[PDB]
């Protein structure tokens, strides 16, 4: 009389790391995710493990294209 | 076994440059494949040791 369960993997700490409006550096990880829940938008690349990272410096923005959520980087005006 | 860690060595520089798995059953013969020999500075044919 025992339980066949009891196993579980480590939480992978996925999700959005830089939310809308956050100024990021090039190569900064924006979304840790499984698959393309968010798709690489403008100045945003998609990593091998589906990690969306900024390709250029700027502010994180979330948009919608063809009904798919995308993460874009809007260039920030130089001061 | 089954998928041994075969070592790909170049034909020219004869340097054991790479190590990769191969299913011996599907590919029993030595894995001859084009790879990059840093000693030669160019792509050369590499085959299993």
């Amino acid at each position: 009389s025992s339980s066949r369960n009891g196993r579980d993997s480590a939480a992978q700490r996925l999700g959005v790391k830089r939310f809308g409006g956050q100024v990021v550096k090039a190569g900064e990880i924006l979304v840790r995710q499984r698959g393309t829940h968010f798709h690489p938008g403008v100045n945003v690349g998609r990593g091998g493990d589906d990690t969306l990272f900024a390709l250029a410096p700027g502010a994180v923005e979330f948009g919608a294209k063809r009904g798919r959520k995308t993460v874009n980087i809007v260039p920030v005006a130089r001061p | 076994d089954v998928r041994p860690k075969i070592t790909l060595a170049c034909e020219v520089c004869k340097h054991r440059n790479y190590i990769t798995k191969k299913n011996r059953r599907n590919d029993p013969d030595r894995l001859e494949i084009k790879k990059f020999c840093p000693n030669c500075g160019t792509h050369q044919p590499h085959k299993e040791s």
């Binding site: - | 860690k5 190590i19 990769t20 798995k21």
Partner: protein, 63 residues
Amino acid sequence: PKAKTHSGASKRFRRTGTGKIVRQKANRRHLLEHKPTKRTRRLDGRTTVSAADNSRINKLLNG
């Protein structure tokens, strides 16, 4: 009685010119076939000891 230095710590840690204690990185000794060269490059070289371990590593190196 002189404070004996810890042999293993002395063999595993080094101090730079500015005093930074540096160390090598694990998981780069064997079982390397499945490790992508990006991972072995990450594990290559020396990195500064973490601030948490810095105190004890300094203790082991000095005495």
